[PDB]
Amino acid sequence: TLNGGITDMLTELANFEKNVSQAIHKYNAYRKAASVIAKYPHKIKSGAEAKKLPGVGTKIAEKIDEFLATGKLRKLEKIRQDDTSSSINFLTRVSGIGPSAARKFVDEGIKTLEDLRKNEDKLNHHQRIGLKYFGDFEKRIPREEMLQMQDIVLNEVKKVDSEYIATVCGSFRRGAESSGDMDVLLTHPSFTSESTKQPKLLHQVVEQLQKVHFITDTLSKGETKFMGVCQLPSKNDEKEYPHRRIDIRLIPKDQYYCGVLYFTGSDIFNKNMRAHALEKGFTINEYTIRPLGTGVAGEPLPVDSEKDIFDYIQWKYREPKDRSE
DNA sequence: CCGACCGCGCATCAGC
DNA sequence: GCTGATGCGC
DNA sequence: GTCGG
Ligand SMILES: Nc1nc2c(ncn2[C@H]2C[C@H](O)[C@@H](COP(=O)(O)OP(=O)(O)OP(=O)(O)O)O2)c(=S)[nH]1
Ligand SMILES: [Ca+2]
Ligand SMILES: [Ca+2]
Ligand SMILES: [Cl-]
Ligand code: NA
Ligand code: NA
């Protein structure tokens, strides 16, 4: 938290561009700069000191100057005062409400937590569950609880078929002491890039996790991506655990290493890596790394480890715990 | 400069 | 019903 | 908003 004052500022600005301005590249620009200043291992004394880092330019320089003097950012102070944009940025904290839906509701006078509860009929399914567990989802999960959840999901995946492999990823695999939510990579030998020797593969796992009341709600579901809700079992008289966001990704087993790369993140690490891949003439997604021959994807290169992906784009390997950009 | 700015799964809707 | 585009999220 | 041809 060396320059916590500054990354916070830039994150709030990032949210405002993402949510009220619907300016996604400004949101990325602001987030990259917050990321690179967070990695910086000195207390920043100057806006010019910051401009030296990639992703800090003039406009962020001047804002860091204003903030270091006054402790504030006038732009942020007035953004806070504005009743409209403050409401739109609140509504996007509900899972399923993004920047268009948040602005559509505040056009209809729906702008506070009491108003969403009154008009749940105007909300789709993902937004209803988002509203139901709004408080729970704001809470972070302790690594202790993440370890309990891991044991339930892996023991249940083993009871459906012992050939499943389930790998917990996200900030957990990077060694976070606390997690936003849980992310499970799933392979089965019957699902590769060649064929899908068995159907319902992801369905079976979700069904069983629902049969034991671990999974409690479904935001979205398909053949390879599940997005929903889960809860640890509690003991007698114990207050129930908070409900938790769970994501499960069924990845073809021969593409495990590219998938576990994707799912370990961070999101910003993923972005710097794929962006650097393009500079080296490659493209990386969760499935493959492919050459660029006129900027059209050639054939998947062969991949036996995570490090093989790092070697193609000519990066030294970085442990999961060092990808938390 | 001043256009380019990762990559993709699922849900929803307009058009056909 | 499909297809593309848009919204939402990872 | 930043930045690289
Ligand atoms: N390429 C890419 N990958 C992403 C993105 N967002 C998330 N991911 C990937 C990497 C993330 O580690 C993984 C899980 O996303 P998640 O929102 O849970 O983030 P996380 O790193 O686990 O952080 P917390 O869950 O602990 O808040 O999905 C974006 S925007 N792009
Ligand atoms: Ca997570
Ligand atoms: Ca997640
Ligand atoms: Cl691919
Ligand atoms: Na810079
Ligand atoms: Na949101």
Side-chain angles (χ1 to χ4, degrees), chain A residues 82-83 85-99 101-113 115-117 119-121 123-133:
Chain A
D82 179 34
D83 287 307
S85 67
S86 173
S87 283
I88 276 168
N89 195 90
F90 168 74
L91 290 188
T92 51
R93 302 159 60 189
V94 184
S95 180
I97 316 291
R103 188 182 281 278
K104 183 165 167 296
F105 291 149
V106 175
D107 293 335
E108 300 151 345
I110 306 173
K111 69 184 50 185
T112 57
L113 194 51
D115 306 348
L116 280 166
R117 306 204 146 110
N119 301 265
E120 207 181 301
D121 67 336
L123 303 180
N124 71 23
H125 179 61
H126 184 156
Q127 299 162 334
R128 271 159 179 261
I129 300 161
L131 170 64
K132 178 154 145 198
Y133 302 112

Short mmCIF file of all heavy atoms in Angstrom, two decimals, chain A residues 81-133, unseen atoms left out:
data_model
loop_
_atom_site.label_atom_id
_atom_site.label_comp_id
_atom_site.label_asym_id
_atom_site.label_seq_id
_atom_site.Cartn_x
_atom_site.Cartn_y
_atom_site.Cartn_z
N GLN A 81 -20.12 14.52 -5.61
CA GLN A 81 -21.30 15.31 -5.27
C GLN A 81 -22.45 15.05 -6.24
O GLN A 81 -23.62 15.14 -5.85
CB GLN A 81 -20.95 16.80 -5.25
N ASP A 82 -22.14 14.73 -7.48
CA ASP A 82 -23.17 14.59 -8.50
C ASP A 82 -24.12 13.45 -8.14
O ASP A 82 -23.70 12.30 -7.99
CB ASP A 82 -22.49 14.35 -9.86
CG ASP A 82 -23.48 14.18 -10.97
OD1 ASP A 82 -24.54 14.82 -10.92
OD2 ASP A 82 -23.20 13.39 -11.90
N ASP A 83 -25.40 13.78 -7.94
CA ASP A 83 -26.33 12.75 -7.49
C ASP A 83 -26.53 11.69 -8.57
O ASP A 83 -26.64 10.50 -8.23
CB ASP A 83 -27.65 13.37 -7.07
CG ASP A 83 -27.55 14.12 -5.74
OD1 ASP A 83 -27.08 13.54 -4.73
OD2 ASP A 83 -27.94 15.30 -5.69
N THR A 84 -26.53 12.07 -9.85
CA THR A 84 -26.81 11.10 -10.90
C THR A 84 -25.68 10.09 -11.02
O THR A 84 -25.88 8.88 -10.81
CB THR A 84 -27.06 11.78 -12.25
N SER A 85 -24.48 10.55 -11.35
CA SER A 85 -23.38 9.62 -11.55
C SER A 85 -23.09 8.81 -10.29
O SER A 85 -22.68 7.65 -10.38
CB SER A 85 -22.13 10.38 -12.02
OG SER A 85 -21.65 11.22 -11.00
N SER A 86 -23.32 9.38 -9.11
CA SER A 86 -23.15 8.60 -7.90
C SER A 86 -24.14 7.44 -7.84
O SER A 86 -23.79 6.34 -7.39
CB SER A 86 -23.30 9.49 -6.67
OG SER A 86 -23.30 8.69 -5.51
N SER A 87 -25.38 7.66 -8.29
CA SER A 87 -26.36 6.59 -8.32
C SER A 87 -26.01 5.53 -9.36
O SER A 87 -26.09 4.33 -9.08
CB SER A 87 -27.75 7.16 -8.57
OG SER A 87 -28.28 7.75 -7.39
N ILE A 88 -25.61 5.95 -10.57
CA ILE A 88 -25.23 4.98 -11.60
C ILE A 88 -24.06 4.12 -11.12
O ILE A 88 -24.06 2.90 -11.30
CB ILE A 88 -24.90 5.71 -12.92
CG1 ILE A 88 -26.17 5.98 -13.72
CG2 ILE A 88 -23.91 4.93 -13.78
CD1 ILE A 88 -25.96 6.93 -14.88
N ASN A 89 -23.07 4.74 -10.47
CA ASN A 89 -21.96 3.95 -9.96
C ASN A 89 -22.36 3.05 -8.80
O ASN A 89 -21.71 2.04 -8.56
CB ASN A 89 -20.81 4.86 -9.53
CG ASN A 89 -19.54 4.08 -9.35
OD1 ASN A 89 -18.76 3.92 -10.29
ND2 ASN A 89 -19.33 3.54 -8.14
N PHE A 90 -23.42 3.40 -8.08
CA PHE A 90 -23.92 2.47 -7.08
C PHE A 90 -24.60 1.28 -7.74
O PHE A 90 -24.38 0.13 -7.34
CB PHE A 90 -24.89 3.17 -6.14
CG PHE A 90 -25.64 2.23 -5.28
CD1 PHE A 90 -25.01 1.60 -4.22
CD2 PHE A 90 -26.96 1.92 -5.56
CE1 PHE A 90 -25.70 0.71 -3.42
CE2 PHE A 90 -27.65 1.03 -4.78
CZ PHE A 90 -27.03 0.43 -3.70
N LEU A 91 -25.45 1.52 -8.74
CA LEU A 91 -26.22 0.43 -9.30
C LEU A 91 -25.32 -0.62 -9.94
O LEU A 91 -25.63 -1.82 -9.88
CB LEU A 91 -27.24 0.96 -10.31
CG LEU A 91 -28.41 1.74 -9.68
CD1 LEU A 91 -29.47 2.06 -10.70
CD2 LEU A 91 -29.01 0.98 -8.49
N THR A 92 -24.18 -0.21 -10.51
CA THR A 92 -23.29 -1.20 -11.13
C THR A 92 -22.65 -2.14 -10.10
O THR A 92 -22.18 -3.21 -10.47
CB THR A 92 -22.22 -0.52 -11.98
OG1 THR A 92 -21.56 0.50 -11.22
CG2 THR A 92 -22.83 0.12 -13.19
N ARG A 93 -22.64 -1.78 -8.82
CA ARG A 93 -22.17 -2.73 -7.84
C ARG A 93 -23.10 -3.94 -7.67
O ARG A 93 -22.69 -4.95 -7.08
CB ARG A 93 -21.97 -2.02 -6.51
CG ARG A 93 -21.01 -0.87 -6.60
CD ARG A 93 -21.22 0.08 -5.45
NE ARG A 93 -21.03 -0.53 -4.14
CZ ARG A 93 -21.32 0.07 -2.99
NH1 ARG A 93 -21.85 1.30 -2.96
NH2 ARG A 93 -21.10 -0.56 -1.84
N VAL A 94 -24.34 -3.88 -8.16
CA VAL A 94 -25.17 -5.08 -8.17
C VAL A 94 -24.72 -5.96 -9.33
O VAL A 94 -24.57 -5.49 -10.46
CB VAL A 94 -26.66 -4.74 -8.29
CG1 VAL A 94 -27.48 -6.00 -8.20
CG2 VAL A 94 -27.10 -3.79 -7.19
N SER A 95 -24.50 -7.24 -9.05
CA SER A 95 -24.05 -8.14 -10.10
C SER A 95 -25.15 -8.30 -11.14
O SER A 95 -26.30 -8.63 -10.82
CB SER A 95 -23.69 -9.50 -9.51
OG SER A 95 -23.26 -10.38 -10.54
N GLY A 96 -24.80 -8.04 -12.41
CA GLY A 96 -25.75 -8.05 -13.49
C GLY A 96 -26.15 -6.67 -13.99
O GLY A 96 -26.56 -6.54 -15.14
N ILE A 97 -26.06 -5.66 -13.13
CA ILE A 97 -26.23 -4.27 -13.54
C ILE A 97 -24.87 -3.74 -14.00
O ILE A 97 -23.95 -3.57 -13.18
CB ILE A 97 -26.78 -3.41 -12.39
CG1 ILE A 97 -27.91 -4.14 -11.67
CG2 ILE A 97 -27.23 -2.04 -12.90
CD1 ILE A 97 -29.12 -4.26 -12.48
N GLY A 98 -24.74 -3.50 -15.30
CA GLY A 98 -23.58 -2.84 -15.84
C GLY A 98 -23.88 -1.38 -16.11
O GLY A 98 -24.86 -0.82 -15.60
N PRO A 99 -23.05 -0.72 -16.93
CA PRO A 99 -23.22 0.72 -17.15
C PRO A 99 -24.45 1.12 -17.97
O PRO A 99 -25.00 2.19 -17.70
CB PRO A 99 -21.92 1.13 -17.85
CG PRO A 99 -20.92 0.13 -17.34
CD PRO A 99 -21.69 -1.17 -17.28
N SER A 100 -24.92 0.31 -18.93
CA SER A 100 -26.17 0.67 -19.61
C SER A 100 -27.38 0.48 -18.69
O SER A 100 -28.19 1.39 -18.51
CB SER A 100 -26.37 -0.13 -20.89
N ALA A 101 -27.49 -0.69 -18.07
CA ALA A 101 -28.64 -0.94 -17.21
C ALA A 101 -28.68 0.01 -16.02
O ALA A 101 -29.76 0.42 -15.58
CB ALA A 101 -28.65 -2.39 -16.74
N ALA A 102 -27.51 0.39 -15.50
CA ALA A 102 -27.50 1.30 -14.36
C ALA A 102 -28.06 2.66 -14.74
O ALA A 102 -28.81 3.28 -13.98
CB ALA A 102 -26.08 1.43 -13.82
N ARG A 103 -27.71 3.13 -15.94
CA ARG A 103 -28.22 4.40 -16.43
C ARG A 103 -29.69 4.29 -16.86
O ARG A 103 -30.45 5.26 -16.74
CB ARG A 103 -27.32 4.88 -17.57
CG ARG A 103 -27.59 6.26 -18.06
CD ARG A 103 -26.67 6.61 -19.21
NE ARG A 103 -25.36 6.98 -18.72
CZ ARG A 103 -25.07 8.19 -18.27
NH1 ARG A 103 -26.01 9.13 -18.24
NH2 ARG A 103 -23.85 8.47 -17.83
N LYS A 104 -30.12 3.11 -17.34
CA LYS A 104 -31.52 2.97 -17.71
C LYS A 104 -32.42 3.02 -16.48
O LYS A 104 -33.51 3.60 -16.53
CB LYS A 104 -31.76 1.68 -18.51
CG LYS A 104 -33.22 1.55 -18.98
CD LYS A 104 -33.43 0.50 -20.06
CE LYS A 104 -34.92 0.18 -20.24
NZ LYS A 104 -35.52 -0.44 -19.01
N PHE A 105 -31.96 2.45 -15.36
CA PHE A 105 -32.77 2.49 -14.15
C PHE A 105 -32.85 3.89 -13.57
O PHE A 105 -33.93 4.32 -13.14
CB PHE A 105 -32.22 1.52 -13.11
CG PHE A 105 -32.40 0.08 -13.49
CD1 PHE A 105 -31.49 -0.88 -13.10
CD2 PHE A 105 -33.47 -0.30 -14.28
CE1 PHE A 105 -31.66 -2.20 -13.46
CE2 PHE A 105 -33.65 -1.62 -14.66
CZ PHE A 105 -32.75 -2.57 -14.25
N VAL A 106 -31.74 4.63 -13.55
CA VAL A 106 -31.77 5.97 -12.95
C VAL A 106 -32.53 6.95 -13.84
O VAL A 106 -32.94 8.01 -13.36
CB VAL A 106 -30.35 6.46 -12.63
CG1 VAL A 106 -30.36 7.89 -12.12
CG2 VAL A 106 -29.71 5.56 -11.58
N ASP A 107 -32.75 6.62 -15.11
CA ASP A 107 -33.73 7.34 -15.93
C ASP A 107 -35.16 7.07 -15.46
O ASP A 107 -36.04 7.91 -15.65
CB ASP A 107 -33.61 6.94 -17.40
CG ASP A 107 -32.31 7.38 -18.04
OD1 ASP A 107 -31.69 8.35 -17.56
OD2 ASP A 107 -31.90 6.74 -19.03
N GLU A 108 -35.42 5.89 -14.92
CA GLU A 108 -36.74 5.50 -14.47
C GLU A 108 -36.96 5.80 -13.00
O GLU A 108 -37.86 5.22 -12.39
CB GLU A 108 -36.98 4.01 -14.72
CG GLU A 108 -36.91 3.57 -16.17
CD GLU A 108 -36.46 2.13 -16.30
OE1 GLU A 108 -35.95 1.58 -15.29
OE2 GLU A 108 -36.60 1.53 -17.39
N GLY A 109 -36.12 6.66 -12.41
CA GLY A 109 -36.23 6.99 -11.01
C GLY A 109 -35.76 5.94 -10.03
O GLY A 109 -35.75 6.20 -8.82
N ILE A 110 -35.36 4.76 -10.50
CA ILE A 110 -34.81 3.72 -9.64
C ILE A 110 -33.32 4.02 -9.43
O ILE A 110 -32.52 3.92 -10.37
CB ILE A 110 -35.03 2.33 -10.25
CG1 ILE A 110 -36.52 2.13 -10.58
CG2 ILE A 110 -34.53 1.23 -9.31
CD1 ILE A 110 -36.84 0.88 -11.34
N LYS A 111 -32.95 4.39 -8.20
CA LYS A 111 -31.59 4.86 -7.97
C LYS A 111 -31.01 4.53 -6.61
O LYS A 111 -29.90 4.97 -6.32
CB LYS A 111 -31.53 6.38 -8.18
CG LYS A 111 -32.26 7.19 -7.13
CD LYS A 111 -32.22 8.66 -7.49
CE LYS A 111 -32.67 8.89 -8.91
NZ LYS A 111 -32.53 10.32 -9.32
N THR A 112 -31.72 3.82 -5.74
CA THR A 112 -31.20 3.48 -4.43
C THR A 112 -31.54 2.03 -4.12
O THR A 112 -32.25 1.36 -4.88
CB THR A 112 -31.77 4.39 -3.33
OG1 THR A 112 -33.20 4.32 -3.34
CG2 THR A 112 -31.31 5.83 -3.53
N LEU A 113 -31.04 1.55 -2.99
CA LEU A 113 -31.24 0.14 -2.66
C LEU A 113 -32.70 -0.16 -2.32
O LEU A 113 -33.19 -1.26 -2.61
CB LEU A 113 -30.32 -0.25 -1.50
CG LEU A 113 -30.17 -1.75 -1.27
CD1 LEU A 113 -29.80 -2.42 -2.57
CD2 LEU A 113 -29.12 -2.03 -0.20
N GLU A 114 -33.42 0.81 -1.74
CA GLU A 114 -34.85 0.60 -1.52
C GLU A 114 -35.61 0.52 -2.83
O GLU A 114 -36.56 -0.26 -2.95
CB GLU A 114 -35.41 1.72 -0.63
N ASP A 115 -35.16 1.26 -3.86
CA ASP A 115 -35.87 1.29 -5.14
C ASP A 115 -35.67 0.01 -5.95
O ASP A 115 -36.59 -0.41 -6.67
CB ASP A 115 -35.42 2.50 -5.97
CG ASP A 115 -35.55 3.81 -5.21
OD1 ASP A 115 -36.19 3.82 -4.14
OD2 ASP A 115 -35.02 4.83 -5.69
N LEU A 116 -34.49 -0.60 -5.89
CA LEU A 116 -34.30 -1.89 -6.55
C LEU A 116 -35.17 -2.96 -5.92
O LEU A 116 -35.75 -3.80 -6.63
CB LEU A 116 -32.83 -2.30 -6.48
CG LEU A 116 -31.81 -1.71 -7.46
CD1 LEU A 116 -30.41 -2.02 -6.95
CD2 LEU A 116 -32.00 -2.26 -8.87
N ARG A 117 -35.27 -2.97 -4.59
CA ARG A 117 -36.10 -3.98 -3.93
C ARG A 117 -37.57 -3.81 -4.27
O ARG A 117 -38.30 -4.81 -4.32
CB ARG A 117 -35.91 -3.91 -2.42
CG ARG A 117 -34.48 -4.02 -2.00
CD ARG A 117 -34.35 -4.53 -0.58
NE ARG A 117 -33.15 -5.35 -0.44
CZ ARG A 117 -32.07 -5.00 0.25
NH1 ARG A 117 -32.03 -3.84 0.89
NH2 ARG A 117 -31.03 -5.83 0.30
N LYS A 118 -38.02 -2.57 -4.53
CA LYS A 118 -39.42 -2.32 -4.87
C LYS A 118 -39.76 -2.78 -6.27
O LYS A 118 -40.93 -3.09 -6.54
CB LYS A 118 -39.75 -0.82 -4.74
N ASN A 119 -38.80 -2.79 -7.19
CA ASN A 119 -39.08 -2.94 -8.61
C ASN A 119 -38.41 -4.17 -9.18
O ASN A 119 -38.08 -4.21 -10.37
CB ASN A 119 -38.66 -1.69 -9.37
CG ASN A 119 -39.38 -0.43 -8.87
OD1 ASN A 119 -40.40 -0.02 -9.41
ND2 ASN A 119 -38.83 0.18 -7.82
N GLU A 120 -38.22 -5.19 -8.34
CA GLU A 120 -37.56 -6.42 -8.76
C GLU A 120 -38.19 -7.01 -10.01
O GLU A 120 -37.53 -7.78 -10.72
CB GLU A 120 -37.61 -7.43 -7.62
CG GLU A 120 -36.47 -8.43 -7.64
CD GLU A 120 -36.55 -9.43 -6.51
OE1 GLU A 120 -36.55 -9.00 -5.33
OE2 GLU A 120 -36.65 -10.65 -6.81
N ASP A 121 -39.46 -6.68 -10.29
CA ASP A 121 -40.07 -7.13 -11.54
C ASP A 121 -39.36 -6.54 -12.76
O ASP A 121 -39.35 -7.15 -13.84
CB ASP A 121 -41.57 -6.79 -11.55
CG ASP A 121 -41.86 -5.29 -11.60
OD1 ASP A 121 -41.00 -4.48 -11.19
OD2 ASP A 121 -42.97 -4.92 -12.05
N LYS A 122 -38.76 -5.37 -12.61
CA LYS A 122 -38.03 -4.80 -13.73
C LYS A 122 -36.61 -5.38 -13.85
O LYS A 122 -35.83 -4.86 -14.65
CB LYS A 122 -37.98 -3.27 -13.61
N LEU A 123 -36.27 -6.43 -13.10
CA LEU A 123 -34.92 -6.99 -13.06
C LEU A 123 -34.90 -8.39 -13.64
O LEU A 123 -35.77 -9.21 -13.33
CB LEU A 123 -34.38 -7.04 -11.63
CG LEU A 123 -34.29 -5.77 -10.78
CD1 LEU A 123 -33.73 -6.10 -9.40
CD2 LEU A 123 -33.43 -4.75 -11.47
N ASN A 124 -33.89 -8.68 -14.44
CA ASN A 124 -33.76 -10.03 -14.98
C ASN A 124 -33.17 -10.97 -13.91
O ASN A 124 -32.94 -10.59 -12.75
CB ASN A 124 -32.94 -10.01 -16.27
CG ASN A 124 -31.46 -9.72 -16.05
OD1 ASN A 124 -30.92 -9.92 -14.96
ND2 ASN A 124 -30.80 -9.26 -17.10
N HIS A 125 -32.92 -12.22 -14.30
CA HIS A 125 -32.59 -13.24 -13.31
C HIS A 125 -31.24 -12.95 -12.65
O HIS A 125 -31.14 -12.90 -11.41
CB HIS A 125 -32.59 -14.62 -13.95
CG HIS A 125 -32.24 -15.72 -13.01
ND1 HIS A 125 -32.98 -16.00 -11.88
CD2 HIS A 125 -31.22 -16.61 -13.02
CE1 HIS A 125 -32.43 -17.01 -11.23
NE2 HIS A 125 -31.36 -17.41 -11.90
N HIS A 126 -30.19 -12.75 -13.46
CA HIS A 126 -28.87 -12.43 -12.92
C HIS A 126 -28.91 -11.19 -12.04
O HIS A 126 -28.23 -11.13 -11.00
CB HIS A 126 -27.87 -12.26 -14.07
CG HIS A 126 -26.44 -12.01 -13.64
ND1 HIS A 126 -25.37 -12.31 -14.45
CD2 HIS A 126 -25.92 -11.50 -12.50
CE1 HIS A 126 -24.25 -12.00 -13.83
NE2 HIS A 126 -24.55 -11.51 -12.64
N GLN A 127 -29.70 -10.18 -12.41
CA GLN A 127 -29.79 -9.00 -11.56
C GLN A 127 -30.56 -9.28 -10.27
O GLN A 127 -30.22 -8.72 -9.22
CB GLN A 127 -30.41 -7.85 -12.34
CG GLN A 127 -29.60 -7.45 -13.55
CD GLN A 127 -30.41 -6.63 -14.53
OE1 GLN A 127 -31.62 -6.75 -14.59
NE2 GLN A 127 -29.74 -5.79 -15.31
N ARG A 128 -31.58 -10.16 -10.30
CA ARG A 128 -32.28 -10.53 -9.07
C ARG A 128 -31.35 -11.20 -8.07
O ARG A 128 -31.33 -10.84 -6.89
CB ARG A 128 -33.46 -11.47 -9.38
CG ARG A 128 -34.77 -10.78 -9.69
CD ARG A 128 -35.69 -11.71 -10.47
NE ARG A 128 -36.98 -11.11 -10.77
CZ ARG A 128 -38.09 -11.33 -10.07
NH1 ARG A 128 -38.08 -12.14 -9.01
NH2 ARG A 128 -39.22 -10.74 -10.42
N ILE A 129 -30.57 -12.19 -8.51
CA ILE A 129 -29.62 -12.83 -7.60
C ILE A 129 -28.57 -11.82 -7.12
O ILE A 129 -28.17 -11.82 -5.95
CB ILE A 129 -28.96 -14.05 -8.26
CG1 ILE A 129 -30.00 -15.08 -8.67
CG2 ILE A 129 -27.91 -14.66 -7.33
CD1 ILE A 129 -29.46 -16.03 -9.68
N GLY A 130 -28.11 -10.96 -8.03
CA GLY A 130 -27.20 -9.89 -7.62
C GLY A 130 -27.77 -9.04 -6.51
O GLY A 130 -27.05 -8.68 -5.57
N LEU A 131 -29.06 -8.70 -6.59
CA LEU A 131 -29.71 -7.91 -5.55
C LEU A 131 -29.92 -8.72 -4.28
O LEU A 131 -29.72 -8.20 -3.17
CB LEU A 131 -31.05 -7.37 -6.05
CG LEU A 131 -32.01 -6.71 -5.04
CD1 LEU A 131 -31.44 -5.44 -4.43
CD2 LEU A 131 -33.33 -6.40 -5.70
N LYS A 132 -30.32 -9.98 -4.41
CA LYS A 132 -30.54 -10.83 -3.25
C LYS A 132 -29.31 -10.89 -2.35
O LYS A 132 -29.41 -10.76 -1.13
CB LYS A 132 -30.95 -12.23 -3.71
CG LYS A 132 -31.18 -13.26 -2.60
CD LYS A 132 -32.15 -14.34 -3.09
CE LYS A 132 -31.85 -15.72 -2.55
NZ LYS A 132 -32.51 -16.82 -3.37
N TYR A 133 -28.12 -11.06 -2.94
CA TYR A 133 -26.90 -11.26 -2.17
C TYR A 133 -25.97 -10.05 -2.21
O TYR A 133 -24.76 -10.18 -2.04
CB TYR A 133 -26.16 -12.50 -2.68
CG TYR A 133 -26.97 -13.78 -2.63
CD1 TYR A 133 -27.37 -14.41 -3.80
CD2 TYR A 133 -27.30 -14.36 -1.42
CE1 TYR A 133 -28.10 -15.59 -3.77
CE2 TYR A 133 -28.04 -15.53 -1.36
CZ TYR A 133 -28.43 -16.15 -2.54
OH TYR A 133 -29.16 -17.32 -2.49
#
